[PDB]
Amino acid sequence: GLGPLQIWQTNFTLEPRMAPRSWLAVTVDTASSAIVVTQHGRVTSVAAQHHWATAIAVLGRPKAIKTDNGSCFTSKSTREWLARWGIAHTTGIPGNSQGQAMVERANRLLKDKIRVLAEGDGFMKRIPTSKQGELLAKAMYALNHF
Amino acid sequence: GLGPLQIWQTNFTLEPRMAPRSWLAVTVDTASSAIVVTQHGRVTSVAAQHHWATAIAVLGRPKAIKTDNGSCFTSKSTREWLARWGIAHTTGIPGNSQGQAMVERANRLLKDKIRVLAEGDGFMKRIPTSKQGELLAKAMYALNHF
Ligand SMILES: [Zn+2]
Ligand SMILES: [Zn+2]
Ligand SMILES: [Zn+2]
Ligand SMILES: [Zn+2]
């Protein structure tokens, strides 16, 4: 019982080295500090739901998800998806230290790690589409399995 | 130290409810019995590598991977990818109880679970492309977080 609470913080951040699909949906499990990230072409309610569907398969179901006031997170579409899963949801103005400083620090570590790995294979600007998925999985791996 | 060994068994299995991308690459971690699955349009060396790239981000790096004698698993492409990662590889004739009974039992539980969930949303034959990914992530979730 007395071991910690399953609460996530999720946000989208922009990363042009991953273009065309340059919207990265990033989720930090505030307990374990495990990071889940996925690639998306557009930030929509459906992009938020598909991401969380992946994160649940990976981390398991959380009790609550903390996001900001973004529409993709407050639409009726998403409110219904979360309800369908029984996951509480609490908003917070963009970046609100309370619920966003972690996922924001995450954004940075992630983009840094994407740059290091990309430049190491000699990709200085955009990563070729066919290597994006493998490069993102490696970054995610490096950041979680420390 | 005296806690168990990180050895995987991987195989592809065919699932037409997931068409066009109906080749499911399935990996069982023989220690934890955790299951990783991904969708692929064609069974190729590159389909095996992309899958394992996902599984590593999810489960961490294994010491060895057991497959059968399939070409996608013995090509020079894959031998080099595995070497690049430092993961030993041991083959076994298709299905060889030794290294395949687990991933074969996995194949069945997975396809059963895909059928149950699909028919529950009223998809009796093929699952609509736009719901495949979410349905597969749920099946994977059900089978791992028991
Ligand atoms: Zn999507
Ligand atoms: Zn926002
Ligand atoms: Zn692929
Ligand atoms: Zn085979």
User: Which H or E run contains B42?
Assistant: none
Cα distance between residue A35 and residue A109, in whole Å: 10
- A58 contacts in B (CB within 8 Å)? 58
β-bridge pairing A35-40 and A23-29? antiparallel
Radius of gyration of chain B (CA): 15
Quick one: three-class SS letters along B119-145?
HHCCCCCCCCHHHHHHHHHHHHHHHHC
Number of alpha carbons in the 13 Å side-chain half-sphere of residue B8 = 26
| Out of A53, A56, A140, closest to residue B57 by CB | A140
Domain encompassing residue A49: 1-146
Resolution reached, in Å? 2.2
CA distance A93 to chain B (A): 29
**Vertex B108 angle, CA B103 and B109, to 5°:** 95
Cα distances (Å, whole numbers) of residue B10 to A101, B83, B101, B128:
39, 17, 11, 26
Do residues B24 and B18 make contact, with C-beta atoms less than 8 angstroms apart? yes
β-bridge pairing B88-90 and B64-66? parallel
Helix axis angle for B97-120 and B129-144, nearest 10°, is 120
Cα distance between residue B82 and residue B76, in whole Å: 10
CA–centroid distance, B13 to ligand 4, in Å, is: 8
Report H helices in B41-96.
45-59, 71-74, 76-85
B130, B141, B146, best to mutate vs chain A, most A CBs in 10 Å: B141
CA–centroid distance, B25 to ligand 3, in Å, is: 11
Cα distances (Å, whole numbers) of residue B63 to A60, A144, B4, B49, B138:
25, 18, 11, 16, 28
| Out of A53, A60, A144, closest to residue B145 by CB | A60
Phi-psi region of B43 (alpha: psi -120 to 50; beta: other; left: phi over 0): beta
Do residues A68 and A96 make contact, with C-beta atoms less than 8 angstroms apart? yes
Cα distance between residue A97 and residue A90, in whole Å: 14
Number of domains in chain B: 1
Cα distance between residue A71 and residue B133, in whole Å: 23
Amino acid of residue B28: V
CA torsion B60-B50-A45-A43 (nearest 10°) is 100
Q: How many Cβ atoms from other residues are within 10 Å of residue A101's Cβ?
A: 12
Dihedral over Cα of A16, A22, A23, A25: its sign: negative
Give the CATH number for residue B8: 3.30.420.10
Where in A84-134 does DSSP place strands (E)? 88-90
User: Which H or E run contains A40?
Assistant: strand A35-40
Cα distances (Å, whole numbers) of residue B13 to B42, B43, B53, B59, B105:
11, 10, 18, 21, 11
CB contact A141 to B (< 8 Å): yes
CA–centroid distance, A42 to ligand 1, in Å, is: 9
The tokens describing A67, both together, are 């996001």
CB contact A112 to B (< 8 Å): no
